[model samples]
Target: GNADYNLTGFSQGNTGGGVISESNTAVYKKVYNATDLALALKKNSGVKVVEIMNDLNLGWNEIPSAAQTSPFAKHNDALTHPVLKQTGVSKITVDGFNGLTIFSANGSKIKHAAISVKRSSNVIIRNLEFDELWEWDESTKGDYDKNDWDYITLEESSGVWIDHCVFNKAYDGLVDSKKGTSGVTISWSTFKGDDGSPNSWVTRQINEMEANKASYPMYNYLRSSAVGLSKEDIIAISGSQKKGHLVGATSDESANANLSITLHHNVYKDIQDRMPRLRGGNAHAYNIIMDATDARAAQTRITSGMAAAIASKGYKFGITSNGAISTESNAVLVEKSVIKDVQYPVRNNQTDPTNATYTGKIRVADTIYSLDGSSFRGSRDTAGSPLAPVPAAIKPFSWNGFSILPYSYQLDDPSTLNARLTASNGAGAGKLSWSKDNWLKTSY
Candidate 1:
């Protein structure tokens, strides 16, 4: 873990994740850019604290030379940027993608990710910010579609904690765990749209459908022809073809059945759907604050009850087998969550409220400040028939002390967790008390 790599004057192709000639050391020293950062994670598999001194503006249009090869490149999804990939790393902590704004420059709104975890364990990603992670195209030029990249992806990896991050305008998912990826906890984060604006993609779809309405004479076919038939069909009709979640998981890869994830105390503002959509996984979601004031109806449509709390409608969570097993197999334990500016929350699932395996204690409101106790439903199952057997609780992973190799430490919970999250959830790097003096910092 030597800091011998020179980061200056190095572009995308030249940077190459950094140089680590030394096989082992206390720390990797300074990682000035994404190239060095990627190299440090790739070469050094032991416990190390990699310090990020400056923002690695991996913006698509920032460097013309590497624009084609950059992870942020347009339609460069086929290319794998080494600086963004890490494998088989243990006990590693990446300190700052926060304060650093990773974006695209051409105003095309296409931005890729800076970090991707694959086959890595015991990793901590703190204080990161992702902006304009979409490819914007004029409706007349071409249809608006999903970008080729995600803000962060965990594939075939586990033991990851993503905290205090800010995600804005990602064309795809902000964070996705797929293909045997598990053991993830995303906490105290913020996910909001760059602008709580209209969906041009849906608009285009509707306009095109209207132009061709006579071709599809049937009423049901006419409704389906529109890009976004209604507020609830926004994601379904959008060109992205991806779920709108701060975090999402899939268990369809080979024999991977368990995609265990815990999301707590996160802020989801002006976003629609998948506040973690699930498929064949055990999800423990609690203490989430979902605010939809920007556009209330679309943002808060979780299910029948959540939609009822908002627009007196019934929308499903859209938990179906994309290519996996039965929808009834998926289990989500959503407890003690608060929804602001939404009416009453409801569900439309296969199982009845008494028999469904899912459990929730959700409360919703029409205003941000007003959270009525009467609105709260305490610990109720999704079905009303025979109770489905509740799965065993997924326990928190054990962390080792300072002296242990691949050292680990416990994160202290704030006294006012909800209040603190409300004030400082998204991209407040160096602002948190723990960020200032976490045990990971002491290692260096």
Candidate 2:
């Protein structure tokens, strides 16, 4: 957080998720021009403090400085610029490699862009764009085959927000859709492409199989050809702190599920993968706006409806309502919103719709709040017979001011929270009303 770290060095390493020719002389221009100056400039900066800014006026070159191959690559060791081996810098922020645009200098080509900023925080990158960075190779065919670049990874950082930006051709759009990280939001931005695009699937074959089979044939029938990790294109909300381990897959570190996010009002165009992916954390995901109506067939085919089905499965992960109905879970509110084009008729899990208002929370777990005439069905039991339902009266709920959390002061000190907001304030009868001064800001 030092102000001295305000200005520094930057490199737009022209490497996608692949490699290039060592024989290409022009390719090495910026890296060569950078010489040791890029490293030396930061070394002399105070407290090992300096900010590296790259508008990419010159073509970006990621000719792995000494940091690339050795200690900096390893998280536990030091990540110092090669020239500054005397100093310790564990984190570097690679800027603007979103698979859209990155420029370096003199003569430039649009092959691939590469840069590495491993183990860093307070890294604020904006105004930069990508050429849809990929994680795979051309052999994969089509954009779906384009592998993903870890656009902006928060492996073990806190309070990060990559807003008003664009991320297209990267592997996983935003990894935080999983769990483990906290206080993160990829808002007011865009994530395009379809690494999980249906085109990547052997569709001609899937089409033939589905036409001749009873159920959708498992695409690979256990054919584990190391086929690209479909988990790519995920907004991985991480809890993992180590390499080669997932947050929940027996990693020593418990998944720090406290990742609360807000992916609202942003336009996500053509996400063949799960849009605003929900992964490892005990996080609550809410969106004031989202659009996935027409792409359901393609999105599910690629990402397996992992995110979309959260609601119907009674999982409550993706709470998208286009006003045909309203959804609530874990005391969260979805007011004056619109959600549409869901695969399931909704409440896909085991909640009694006839008696249940809002079935449950799909983000983390199942917790039904109010039952608004929704028919709930329990999952089949040992013999495959449906389980009995919990008999309860359906309760109608509403959130205006009296209906839900409305007062600012009631947020923390709910002791003074107006329970009467829902009650008839003499004049309004059963309706709720507020005095002109019922709303007020708290003093610091």
Candidate 3:
């Protein structure tokens, strides 16, 4: 009953399927990627969809906001200051080509530009483009390090949507009211760079701009739209117990409060390389929707159910274990979405913190998978086909391999091998091995 409905309407497949294409390099290499996005939107005639354009385009030069330190610092210092009084030098400028480009005029003066509050609410951004300033391009003279165009904060904002917006450089794609904000939606938005090389300046920026400072570069994989890394590559979560672990919890305060949340109608592309994580105090994420075609679809489904948020210490600070998403005092409903072109997708319900994960209709139209498919199919795969695996050869030997399976096992927990191996460990281990060796009835 706590379930709030959310819906999705995009092409089912990665290629020629969604409003955007991540598989074809030529599509991005030749024509502007946004052009293809426009074509995809053509199918939707009756709706009034907002078009967030590339800064390179004629209209919309820059976002309306002054630069500020990372808003994720637990509060909004910049918002309290007068609108445009130049507290610190505005690090991010509005180049028509660069939506919110970052640069530096001061030497050794580390500055961060944050986008929050002002031009906010009920806005859905997809198929857009962005980059650091011209001075920060890789071709520029030795700047020692690339410009930090980090921090995308949405505070005290409600009914906001961000789907399919690609980032060339960013500290965090969709970070919100860790400073007291809520009632927002961010899905399908990508957090990767264009350069194929692993250490491309753009990618490096993701690591360098972190306020918390992670040892390794944090590549976010919610879908299959990333480069340099694949499902085969494995990145561990920061649960080392000593390295000042990444904290997770919900707060009793305003933005950090354990409130109802929805992550619907978006795709989390290719997270097999690593999991797209949530950390902090006593947070509740509900109706958090996604597409499964991206490499991590199956894993996320299982991972969401099993993994519990560490719930570190109290309302102040702490780190949660990164398994799948755990249920909390808040109600969680992950339903009525597609899993790699199929439907009735299944997710694991590992740890039921306080509230249990449930299912319901996201949108009226979304419910019709087969005319009577119900209102928005839960992420659980009920059809004959299960979520496709990332390919055994490409999948490095790890627990993450469960994601590559062709269909949702439907038994339980797609992230761990417990169920699949249960039958084998019980009594079928000897029999299953025999089946693998000989097709005929030649059991010794």
Candidate 4:
């Protein structure tokens, strides 16, 4: 079967919206408001489950023709650009709901929205395209402001499984499990920074950097500061994905201590960091690929401090990828995965007192292969350097809480991991469909 919908990994027994009853007999053609997310047909009763039959435009209604006139360019000036108009609830807050499942028909793309689950259990979201939830940083200081626009945020929630979905760039995070959330599995999914087209956000932002080179600052071999702005500085400003999956948000024991997350057979394409950046828990990632060679190629001219290598024909390039599978006082094992053209495949340690604090085990315990027989790797390897191995100081450990993966999963060979996962019939939304009879009966 194309879709691997089996309950696996950290969230093994999560029966999301089990057996839709009369009270939960509502199928939405479209969802517009965040408040309407948990708002069941019958008041005083929380919605046990909700199904989306079509694509939705959430939390932004009055955008009208005026805002979208200019085609809504990302990396656009936040002050002048048309920001996402908050219709009602800024974020979908599903609170205290057990067995809540929000799914969609095949190819149902959910746009311009953010969803958060609080104090919930047995939740599942699958087979949907989550995108357009990004915005220009209000400050334009090159970082996300106080908006907290995440595609999925779990606060004090658990037993959640997100599968077979496509996630694009967001203002903050693609998926963030925060504040005591546990037993979550994100599988067979795709997380992309840009669409690999000339019109993509990464390309556009890189273009802006090239257009206004003399405005920012310059960095050469001398590390000297010149009067005019440098293209490298602009490339440095190219805003791509900052955070991917952040398992734990806080340092306190209540939030960071008991976290458990599993990411397997997922496509981490052109992502910047946090594939994922764990705080203090047990996270296992296997048969995954962190493909950033394209991004590195796009920014090669700037990163390599070369002005003549600029080729603006198409935007197949991505931005900076800081580190892949970072651990902070936690244990993480990335077994049998391909780390392609990434700078720091496993960021286990850092100088400052940071999440790279390395109080735990960060193990990349397998081969880093030369995938595909074509010249793809050779051409893409032009700019990006060879990946750094996991440091000897923090090797893969299987003791105490680190040996906690209690589920079974089929791991593909590392040599063919990249092509196999990203094949034509691969991960992402619209590729899987749930038949009518499947949803008519419940107990999934």
The CA lDDT of each predicted structure is: 0.40, 0.27, 0.25, 0.61
Give lDDT: candidate 2, residue 392: 28
Best of the two (1, 4) by lDDT: 4
lDDT for 257 (candidate 3): 34
| TM-score-best of 1 and 4 | 4
Of the candidates numbered 2 and 3, which has the greater TM-score value? 2
lDDT of 4: 0.61
Residue 52 Cα positional deviation in candidate 2, in Å, after optimal superposition: 8.0
Q: What is the full ranking by lDDT, best candidate first?
A: 4, 1, 2, 3
Better of 2 and 4 by lDDT: 4
Please give the range of 10 consecutive residues that has the lowest summed lDDT in model 2: 237-246
Choose the strongest candidate by lDDT.
4
Model 1 whole-model lDDT (C-alpha atoms): 0.40
Report the lDDT tens digits of candidate 4 across residue range 1-444.
533446678888887776665343453313333334434412224555566667766544533433321112122223211334333213555677677667766757777667777788888887788876665442434456556678889988889888778998887899999887888988878898765466655455445535553442222211223222243443333444667887877653546767888888888876778888776677888778887765665555354323322222111223445555444567677778877656666665443334345555565656463322212221112234233334435444553264556877767677887787787657777765557334322234
Off by over 4 Å in 1: 1-26, 43-47, 60-114, 137-146, 196-256, 297-328, 341-374, 382-418, 424-430, 433-444
RMSD of 1: 12.2
The per-prediction tally of clashing pairs is 21, 85, 55, 3
Q: What TM value does model 4 have?
A: 0.75
Winning candidate number (TM-score)? 4
Task: Give the Å error, residue 259, model 3.
Answer: 4.1
**For residues 318-416, what per-residue lDDT tens digits would candidate 2 score against the true structure?**
222211111222112221112223222122112344534333223211211112233322221223212211122312322212332222111112122
After superposition, which runs of candidate 2 have C-alpha atoms over 4 Å from their true positions? Answer: 1-121, 135-148, 177-179, 194-253, 273-275, 279-288, 293-360, 363-444
Greater TM-score among 3 and 4 belongs to 4
